[PDB]
Enzyme design. Structure first.
Site, mmCIF file in Angstrom:
data_model
loop_
_atom_site.group_PDB
_atom_site.id
_atom_site.type_symbol
_atom_site.label_atom_id
_atom_site.label_comp_id
_atom_site.label_asym_id
_atom_site.label_seq_id
_atom_site.Cartn_x
_atom_site.Cartn_y
_atom_site.Cartn_z
ATOM 1 N N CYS A 41 1.022 -1.062 -0.058
ATOM 2 C CA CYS A 41 0.081 -0.016 0.029
ATOM 3 C C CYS A 41 0.864 1.311 0.108
ATOM 4 N N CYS A 46 -1.455 2.047 -2.921
ATOM 5 C CA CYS A 46 -2.606 3.085 -2.529
ATOM 6 C C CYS A 46 -1.835 4.408 -2.703
ATOM 7 N N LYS A 49 -0.077 5.486 -5.847
ATOM 8 C CA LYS A 49 -1.060 5.663 -6.729
ATOM 9 C C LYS A 49 -2.111 6.891 -6.528
ATOM 10 N N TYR A 174 -9.512 -2.446 -11.146
ATOM 11 C CA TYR A 174 -9.092 -1.213 -10.484
ATOM 12 C C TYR A 174 -7.783 -0.761 -11.070
ATOM 13 N N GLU A 178 -7.361 2.585 -13.062
ATOM 14 C CA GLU A 178 -6.593 3.818 -12.353
ATOM 15 C C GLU A 178 -5.327 4.347 -13.313
ATOM 16 N N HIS A 435 -27.017 21.437 -0.160
ATOM 17 C CA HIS A 435 -27.045 22.058 -1.385
ATOM 18 C C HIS A 435 -26.089 23.281 -1.550
ATOM 19 N N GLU A 440 -26.177 15.025 -2.587
ATOM 20 C CA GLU A 440 -27.554 15.269 -2.234
ATOM 21 C C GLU A 440 -28.605 14.656 -3.303
HETATM 22 C C1 LIG Z 1 -25.472 34.713 -0.855
HETATM 23 C C2 LIG Z 1 -26.293 33.463 -0.467
HETATM 24 C C3 LIG Z 1 -25.519 32.097 -0.569
HETATM 25 C C4 LIG Z 1 -26.476 31.228 -0.174
HETATM 26 N N1 LIG Z 1 -25.797 29.811 -0.177
HETATM 27 C C5 LIG Z 1 -26.825 28.875 0.091
HETATM 28 C C6 LIG Z 1 -26.255 27.414 0.033
HETATM 29 O O1 LIG Z 1 -24.960 27.327 -0.479
HETATM 30 N N2 LIG Z 1 -26.903 26.393 0.488
HETATM 31 C C7 LIG Z 1 -28.114 26.572 0.710
HETATM 32 O O2 LIG Z 1 -28.982 25.660 1.213
HETATM 33 N N3 LIG Z 1 -28.557 27.707 0.938
HETATM 34 C C8 LIG Z 1 -28.180 28.976 0.714
HETATM 35 N N4 LIG Z 1 -28.459 30.164 0.638
HETATM 36 C C9 LIG Z 1 -29.888 30.613 1.550
HETATM 37 C C10 LIG Z 1 -31.008 30.081 0.246
HETATM 38 O O3 LIG Z 1 -30.859 30.717 -0.689
HETATM 39 C C11 LIG Z 1 -32.265 30.356 1.111
HETATM 40 O O4 LIG Z 1 -32.336 29.710 2.433
HETATM 41 C C12 LIG Z 1 -33.599 29.827 0.193
HETATM 42 O O5 LIG Z 1 -33.347 30.635 -1.019
HETATM 43 C C13 LIG Z 1 -34.754 30.093 1.007
HETATM 44 O O6 LIG Z 1 -35.936 29.998 0.383
HETATM 45 P P1 LIG Z 1 -37.077 30.686 0.390
HETATM 46 O O7 LIG Z 1 -38.597 30.000 -0.316
HETATM 47 O O8 LIG Z 1 -37.640 30.927 1.921
HETATM 48 O O9 LIG Z 1 -37.058 32.328 -0.182
HETATM 49 P P2 LIG Z 1 -36.405 32.601 -1.594
HETATM 50 O O10 LIG Z 1 -35.646 31.549 -2.357
HETATM 51 O O11 LIG Z 1 -35.497 33.794 -1.132
HETATM 52 O O12 LIG Z 1 -37.696 33.047 -2.412
HETATM 53 C C14 LIG Z 1 -38.668 33.891 -1.973
HETATM 54 C C15 LIG Z 1 -39.206 34.620 -3.142
HETATM 55 O O13 LIG Z 1 -40.466 35.353 -2.864
HETATM 56 C C16 LIG Z 1 -40.669 36.502 -3.712
HETATM 57 N N5 LIG Z 1 -41.338 37.609 -2.890
HETATM 58 C C17 LIG Z 1 -41.203 38.052 -1.829
HETATM 59 N N6 LIG Z 1 -42.136 38.860 -1.504
HETATM 60 C C18 LIG Z 1 -43.174 38.625 -2.218
HETATM 61 C C19 LIG Z 1 -44.433 38.910 -2.411
HETATM 62 N N7 LIG Z 1 -45.336 39.530 -1.372
HETATM 63 N N8 LIG Z 1 -45.368 38.675 -3.349
HETATM 64 C C20 LIG Z 1 -44.672 37.683 -4.464
HETATM 65 N N9 LIG Z 1 -43.417 37.238 -4.381
HETATM 66 C C21 LIG Z 1 -42.568 37.796 -3.262
HETATM 67 C C22 LIG Z 1 -39.066 36.994 -3.702
HETATM 68 O O14 LIG Z 1 -39.071 37.661 -5.033
HETATM 69 C C23 LIG Z 1 -38.333 35.526 -3.938
HETATM 70 O O15 LIG Z 1 -38.154 35.049 -5.170
HETATM 71 C C24 LIG Z 1 -27.929 31.353 0.447
HETATM 72 C C25 LIG Z 1 -28.028 32.642 0.494
HETATM 73 C C26 LIG Z 1 -27.542 33.680 0.090
HETATM 74 C C27 LIG Z 1 -28.152 35.063 -0.026
HETATM 75 C C1 LIG Z 2 -1.380 -0.748 -7.548
HETATM 76 C C2 LIG Z 2 -2.208 -0.944 -6.300
HETATM 77 C C3 LIG Z 2 -3.020 0.161 -5.720
HETATM 78 C C4 LIG Z 2 -3.782 -0.061 -4.654
HETATM 79 N N1 LIG Z 2 -4.636 1.009 -4.223
HETATM 80 C C5 LIG Z 2 -5.220 0.570 -3.208
HETATM 81 C C6 LIG Z 2 -6.261 1.706 -2.575
HETATM 82 O O1 LIG Z 2 -6.226 3.044 -3.075
HETATM 83 N N2 LIG Z 2 -6.876 1.459 -1.448
HETATM 84 C C7 LIG Z 2 -6.827 0.132 -0.776
HETATM 85 O O2 LIG Z 2 -7.449 0.052 0.194
HETATM 86 N N3 LIG Z 2 -5.906 -0.727 -1.269
HETATM 87 C C8 LIG Z 2 -5.281 -0.514 -2.229
HETATM 88 N N4 LIG Z 2 -4.414 -1.567 -2.764
HETATM 89 C C9 LIG Z 2 -4.405 -2.922 -2.122
HETATM 90 C C10 LIG Z 2 -3.652 -2.684 -0.806
HETATM 91 O O3 LIG Z 2 -2.250 -2.582 -1.170
HETATM 92 C C11 LIG Z 2 -3.545 -4.179 -0.230
HETATM 93 O O4 LIG Z 2 -4.751 -4.804 -0.048
HETATM 94 C C12 LIG Z 2 -2.899 -4.116 1.190
HETATM 95 O O5 LIG Z 2 -1.543 -3.862 0.735
HETATM 96 C C13 LIG Z 2 -2.950 -5.580 1.781
HETATM 97 O O6 LIG Z 2 -2.275 -5.895 2.968
HETATM 98 P P1 LIG Z 2 -1.511 -6.890 3.418
HETATM 99 O O7 LIG Z 2 -0.918 -6.888 4.547
HETATM 100 O O8 LIG Z 2 -2.438 -8.220 2.968
HETATM 101 O O9 LIG Z 2 -0.383 -7.283 2.163
HETATM 102 P P2 LIG Z 2 0.758 -6.311 1.922
HETATM 103 O O10 LIG Z 2 0.725 -4.759 2.416
HETATM 104 O O11 LIG Z 2 1.460 -6.451 0.436
HETATM 105 O O12 LIG Z 2 2.190 -6.860 2.903
HETATM 106 C C14 LIG Z 2 2.846 -7.870 2.938
HETATM 107 C C15 LIG Z 2 4.167 -7.703 3.291
HETATM 108 O O13 LIG Z 2 4.741 -9.009 3.467
HETATM 109 C C16 LIG Z 2 6.016 -9.150 2.947
HETATM 110 N N5 LIG Z 2 6.250 -10.586 2.876
HETATM 111 C C17 LIG Z 2 5.606 -11.508 2.031
HETATM 112 N N6 LIG Z 2 6.281 -12.882 2.388
HETATM 113 C C18 LIG Z 2 7.236 -12.565 3.311
HETATM 114 C C19 LIG Z 2 7.673 -13.739 4.166
HETATM 115 N N7 LIG Z 2 7.400 -14.905 3.779
HETATM 116 N N8 LIG Z 2 8.523 -13.017 5.305
HETATM 117 C C20 LIG Z 2 8.576 -11.848 5.642
HETATM 118 N N9 LIG Z 2 7.837 -10.847 4.890
HETATM 119 C C21 LIG Z 2 7.143 -11.281 3.754
HETATM 120 C C22 LIG Z 2 5.930 -8.162 1.811
HETATM 121 O O14 LIG Z 2 7.213 -7.821 1.413
HETATM 122 C C23 LIG Z 2 5.155 -7.111 2.567
HETATM 123 O O15 LIG Z 2 5.634 -6.141 2.864
HETATM 124 C C24 LIG Z 2 -3.666 -1.145 -4.068
HETATM 125 C C25 LIG Z 2 -2.673 -2.270 -4.495
HETATM 126 C C26 LIG Z 2 -1.908 -1.989 -5.445
HETATM 127 C C27 LIG Z 2 -0.881 -3.224 -6.049
#
Ligand SMILES: Cc1cc2nc3c(=O)[nH]c(=O)nc-3n(C[C@H](O)[C@H](O)[C@H](O)COP(=O)(O)OP(=O)(O)OC[C@H]3O[C@@H](n4cnc5c(N)ncnc54)[C@H](O)[C@@H]3O)c2cc1C
Ligand SMILES: Cc1cc2nc3c(=O)[nH]c(=O)nc-3n(C[C@H](O)[C@H](O)[C@H](O)COP(=O)(O)OP(=O)(O)OC[C@H]3O[C@@H](n4cnc5c(N)ncnc54)[C@H](O)[C@@H]3O)c2cc1C
Ligand SMILES: [Cl-]
Ligand SMILES: [Cl-]
Ligand SMILES: [Cl-]
Ligand SMILES: [Cl-]
Ligand SMILES: [Cl-]
Ligand SMILES: [Cl-]
Ligand SMILES: [Cl-]
Ligand SMILES: [Cl-]
Ligand code: NI
Ligand code: NI
Ligand code: NI
Ligand code: NI
Lengths: 453, 451
Positions: A41, A46, A49, A174, A178, A435, A440
């Protein structure tokens, strides 16, 4: 030399995890490692890689910046990426070297083999323990085919000191996928071939299909139901000859990405009377026990989810069981989440739709969606995210969650908690959306695409 | 003109949600809107903000690219143009969809005339059910020279990037605007009355946000109450009520909260209770004190978020028009994201909130780290996380994260928290590796325990 509570064979993910928890319960622990702590690994898996994945993620970001009004030119210094990657990996290795000493673990360098049920030998030195945990991991398969040595594996990939211009990847699990994404993102020509009728065959078909779409749009060339018969040198590279005679040709790098074999070939399993399969996997019960008392196996060689955190959790739980009186303690191997680090990534936890059909009846209510995330609002042709919720029974218990697209690499860890708790669709739908974002969409799926029957 | 099942006042997040769901149950629906469909969120809120946040995120990505070996390097008019076109299409969608649904659209400002009648530019309309979702507007303090500053509305109207911005208020809007402006290379200073940024959020989030913003070169002034704005040479000055004078700012943005659009709405004529602050009280089911009249969204004084307006709107329509007599929104454990750079996210209670509501029963887990995202960069922002758990069972009552990926991280955790997840539920979940979310399921040893 025989007063060890624990011998962990292998200083990889599983071995480190069991040794660390055992040492933390005040046990006397020996750890055997023939290569480097961190195993696959940290050193060739791992971590490297994911570091290279960040580079391709940033390369995509630079491509996309002008659309959002952000000035950015646009080319990879591969030597620089490798240098920073290795420095980063090196420090992780150094941490584990120091930490193993800090823990008081007896580190033994070299290759262990069992000599009997409760003793190993490493370069002539015999050692016994009450408990021996085998965690020797795996290695890339290179098929026994003509010219196979002209190819490289993922190990050779992470060894590459320059970027190859024209890559063929053989295998679309894999690592094939990869590596394809990384290399094409760095502007290499990339062709992938696969035996199966779709990429990532083990994954849900919606993920396979969307991945195929994204990769095609990236300019990756794919050949499905393509069985490699041999590799041969041409002028300027190696070719790839299929079963049916199709030649691909001209690749300065061919990467075998066709699976991993377990390092259990001469471990003296026969000498210790430990059951092993023809494929080298060591069977275990739910508690990592082999057929021999005091001998356990975890990680990759057990044939279960081939992932680091699976090796780690299995190891930690075993040490709790053996050394902290937690006799029922074991890892649940259901609903283990994973990410495939394509560009953009995909992730899943639980069952694909066909798996769910196989294990359960047609009791399936399937929800899905596809969309272009706001990440690509001001770009021309961003990849579309796709999501599937696989639900089962009248109560629509969520049995699979599947996502591919922007942010998918950090999306599903929490969904894995919910799924492990037996979340239903109702649990999902009653959760207020965040969101704006992609996650989601998973809690606001309305009409199912499929229902039981 | 009186045969409507529903009048939704306001075509924002809430009104659109209730109108859409009621129209889908086969009801006859009138929607009143004085400005543009989509309300604040679509036009001057969530959407334009997030679009600009992507630009800021890409600017940082280009900053960081060479560290990973990738060669690299704001045309604000171009950002504005692409953003507006994107917003436009959402507007257009809702305009056509409202028509598609068969909803009667009424343009103009509604006022109640009686308990069941509104008047919009001289035309009276009655319905069985009238839902008030009129949203809010930015507050501009009644202070000398306050008109020298602009609001979030004026920010999204900006056709050119301002060079030297003062942001007044460090709630989510102030923090978000400060972050994108500074990543675009503007000089930015934020001032705030409170002793820390994002006072409503957990202190670990406020502190690491402060750290990240300082490292990004944003200047902050805490416990800073502006008394007046004055014109100076080359800009405008912030004067605090201790005489402190700040600078020659290109742009001074008020971000000190939002007031509800309930002042000129005929609420008196309809006998509808409304607070001195203009919020309309409601029960758990969005009911006002007058039968047939409901309020949702921002004017209800609950979580001022678009998905809260939507879910409250959708559940109301289910209750009124689909016989789901007990349907209501749970306002506990609503997840949110603050789109700082890097972003933060939470669901549930901050540590002090959990102390106040639940008492001395808290097991608190924290971690800080630099994600792999900055592996090959020199000074990446550090992620910080807190788990707030309660009781012997360590029920997870708050999840808090700031750092890379935080904006897509917690939606799933919100589902688990809603389900009453405990620390055991979290720890029994296998980590995804490598990434940041895994740190949330691998927290070992609490920083604080009861006592
Ligand atoms: C900068 C910013 C970033 C944000 N980022 C995220 C985020 O990443 N993830 C997340 O989950 N939330 C985020 N939010 C919050 C999210 O936008 C709000 O929680 C969500 O829009 C709330 O939904 P709402 O229905 O209560 O109001 P709104 O989506 O604001 O809708 C209310 C609507 O009613 C209208 N309205 C108001 N009064 C009247 C009226 N009396 N008559 C007719 N229409 C009217 C308005 O024009 C508006 O279109 C973010 C907010 C801001 C400002
Ligand atoms: C290219 C590649 C990419 C991989 N990517 C991932 C990944 O992203 N995520 C993941 O979870 N796994 C990944 N793996 C798999 C992971 O590496 C193995 O499942 C893990 O190393 C298994 O652990 P192990 O103890 O069984 O054997 P190893 O880690 O191979 O250890 C066995 C050890 O025993 C030694 N040995 C062997 N015979 C003897 C002996 N008789 N006396 C003393 N020492 C001995 C060897 O030299 C070695 O050091 C990847 C494997 C490969 C080859
Ligand atoms: Cl990517
Ligand atoms: Cl110590
Ligand atoms: Cl040897
Ligand atoms: Cl071997
Ligand atoms: Cl239709
Ligand atoms: Cl009027
Ligand atoms: Cl008003
Ligand atoms: Cl960002
Ligand atoms: Ni001994
Ligand atoms: Ni013996
Ligand atoms: Ni009528
Ligand atoms: Ni009347």
């Amino acid at each position: 030399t025989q007063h060890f509570d624990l011998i962990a064979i292998g200083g990889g993910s599983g071995g480190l995890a069991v040794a660390e928890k055992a040492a933390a319960f005040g046990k006397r622990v020996a750890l055997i490692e023939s290569k480097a702590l961190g195993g696959t690994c940290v050193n060739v898996g791992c971590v490297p890689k994911k570091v290279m994945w960040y580079a391709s993620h940033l390369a995509e970001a630079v491509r996309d910046a002008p659309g959002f009004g952000v000035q950015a030119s646009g080319t990879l210094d591969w030597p620089r990426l490798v240098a920073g990657r290795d420095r980063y990996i090196g420090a992780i290795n150094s941490f584990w070297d120091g930490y193993v000493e800090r823990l008081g673990i007896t580190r033994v360098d070299g290759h262990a083999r069992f000599v009997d049920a409760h003793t190993i030998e490493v370069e002539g030195q015999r050692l016994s323990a009450d408990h021996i945990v085998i965690a020797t991991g795996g290695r890339p398969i290179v098929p026994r085919l003509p010219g196979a040595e002209l190819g490289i594996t993922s190990d050779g990939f992470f060894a590459l000191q320059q970027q190859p211009k024209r890559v063929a990847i053989i295998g679309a699990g894999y690592i094939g996928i990869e590596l394809a994404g990384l290399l094409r993102s760095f502007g290499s020509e990339v062709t992938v071939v696969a035996l199966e009728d779709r990429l990532l065959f083990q994954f849900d078909p919606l993920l396979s299909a969307t991945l195929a779409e994204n990769m095609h749009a990236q300019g990756i060339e794919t050949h499905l139901e393509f069985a490699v018969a041999a590799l041969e040198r041409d002028a300027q590279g190696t070719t790839l000859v299929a079963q049916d005679g199709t030649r691909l040709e001209g690749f300065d790098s061919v990467i075998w990405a066709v699976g991993r074999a377990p390092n259990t070939r001469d471990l003296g399993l026969e000498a210790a009377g430990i059951e092993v399969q023809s494929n080298g996997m060591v069977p275990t019960d739910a508690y990592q026990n082999t057929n021999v008392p005091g001998v356990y196996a975890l990680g990759d060689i057990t044939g279960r989810d081939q992932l680091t955190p699976v090796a780690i959790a299995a190891g930690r739980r075993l040490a709790e069981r053996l050394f902290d009186g937690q006799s029922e303690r074991k890892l649940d191997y259901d609903n283990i989440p994973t990410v495939v680090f394509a560009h953009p990534p995909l992730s899943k936890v639980g069952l694909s739709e066909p798996e769910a059909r196989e294990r359960l009846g047609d009791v399936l209510t399937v929800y899905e969606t596809s969309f272009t995330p706001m990440r690509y609002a001001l770009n021309e042709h961003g990849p579309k995210t796709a999501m599937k919720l696989v639900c089962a029974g009248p109560e629509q218990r969520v049995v699979g969650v599947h996502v591919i697209g922007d942010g998918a690499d950090e999306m599903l860890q929490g969904f894995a908690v919910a799924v492990k708790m037996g979340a239903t669709k109702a649990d999902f739908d009653n959760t207020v959306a965040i969101h704006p974002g992609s996650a989601e969409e998973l809690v606001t799926l309305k009409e199912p695409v499929r229902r039981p029957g």
